Amino acid sequence: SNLNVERVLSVHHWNDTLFSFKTTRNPSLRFENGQFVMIGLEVDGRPLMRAYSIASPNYEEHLEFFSIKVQNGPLTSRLQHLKEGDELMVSRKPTGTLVTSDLLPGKHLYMLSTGTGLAPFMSLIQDPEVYERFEKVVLIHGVRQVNELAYQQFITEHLPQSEYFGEAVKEKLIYYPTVTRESFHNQGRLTDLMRSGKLFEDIGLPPINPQDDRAMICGSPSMLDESCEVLDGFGLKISPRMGEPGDYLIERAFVEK
Numbered sequence: 155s156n157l158n159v160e161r162v163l164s165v166h167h168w169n170d171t172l173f174s175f176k177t178t179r180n181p182s183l184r185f186e187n188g189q190f191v192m193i194g195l196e197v198d199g200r201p202l203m204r205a206y207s208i209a210s211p212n213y214e215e216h217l218e219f220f221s222i223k224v225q226n227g228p229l230t231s232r233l234q235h236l237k238e239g240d241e242l243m244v245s246r247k248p249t250g251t252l253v254t255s256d257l258l259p260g261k262h263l264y265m266l267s268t269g270t271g272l273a274p275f276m277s278l279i280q281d282p283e284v285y286e287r288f289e290k291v292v293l294i295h296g297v298r299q300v301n302e303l304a305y306q307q308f309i310t311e312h313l314p315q316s317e318y319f320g321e322a323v324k325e326k327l328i329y330y331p332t333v334t335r336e337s338f339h340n341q342g343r344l345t346d347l348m349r350s351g352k353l354f355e356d357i358g359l360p361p362i363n364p365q366d367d368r369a370m371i372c373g374s375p376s377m378l379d380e381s382c383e384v385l386d387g388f389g390l391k392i393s394p395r396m397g398e399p400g401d402y403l404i405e406r407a408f409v410e411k
């Protein structure tokens with residue numbers, strides 16, 4: 155079995171459909187910030203594995219995962235009961251398309267996400283390299299309800315306080331959460347706010363162009379088609395394949411089964 159066995163260090167529930175947890179990390183597991191790996195539990199003879207983006211920076215000696223809670227699992231129906239000390243299986247080799255290396259040089263990096271698609275971006279915003287490569291980093295997190303804005307305080311209060319890169323955060327990181335169904339100051343779907351050009355007006359940056367702007371997209375399969383349509387409109391060109399650099403990168407946060 156080519157699977158590492160990690161133990162849960164802590165868990166935290168945001169609401170009844172979201173929760174995060176931290177585990178130990180075997181030093182053989184190396185990854186690029188933004189990549190995903192497979193995690194799972196042993197259930198009735200076979201390990202039940204699922205793809206999960208790593209929500210922690212690669213320089214830390216522990217892992218963190220941001221998870222959804224689906225009525226029927228079979229994984230999250232069980233995973234939601236994770237307790238400190240519980241064991242988890244993690245694969246050996248990470249993979250994925252959301253890495254800064256496949257991004258042609260630019261000055262602004264837009265991270266477009268919805269729901270749990272925020273996960274890979276949590277490791278990216280704590281990567282001193284993205285701050286070294288870009289002038290501004292815009293983290294957009296689209297959601298349905300206010301209680302779904304996980305990591306709010308962390309991004310807003312704690313990150314700017316960092317002793318190692320807090321200055322870069324305050325100076326380069328623009329957090330722009332949008333809520334769809336409830337009263338919120340950034341009302342609507344991120345796709346509509348970007349297409350109309352309002353988003354840029356709100357954040358003080360000029361409209362997107364294929365020379366200064368790069369992006370990464372992680373959300374529902376439908377949100378992706380809609381986001382590509384919006385970015386292609388500004389003239390950006392998607393990377394043709396994993397390993398080939400382009401103006402923007404996309405990856406599904408989950409699949410429609």
Ligand SMILES: Cc1cc2nc3c(=O)[nH]c(=O)nc-3n(C[C@H](O)[C@H](O)[C@H](O)COP(=O)(O)OP(=O)(O)OC[C@H]3O[C@@H](n4cnc5c(N)ncnc54)[C@H](O)[C@@H]3O)c2cc1C
Pocket residue numbers: 190204205206207208220221222224226227228229230231250269270273274405406407408409410411
């Ligand atoms: C590259 C990649 C990265 C992924 N990263 C993550 C991640 O960081 N966190 C994560 O929770 N999941 C992630 N997923 C998908 C996720 O792993 C699976 O949906 C989940 O493990 C399925 O567990 P389950 O057995 O309970 O659900 P399923 O077998 O998926 O069945 C539940 C159903 O719920 C819906 N659903 C599933 N996952 C989600 C979700 N996250 N948000 C909203 N609706 C959903 C789908 O319609 C799905 O068929 C990723 C998938 C891929 C391909």
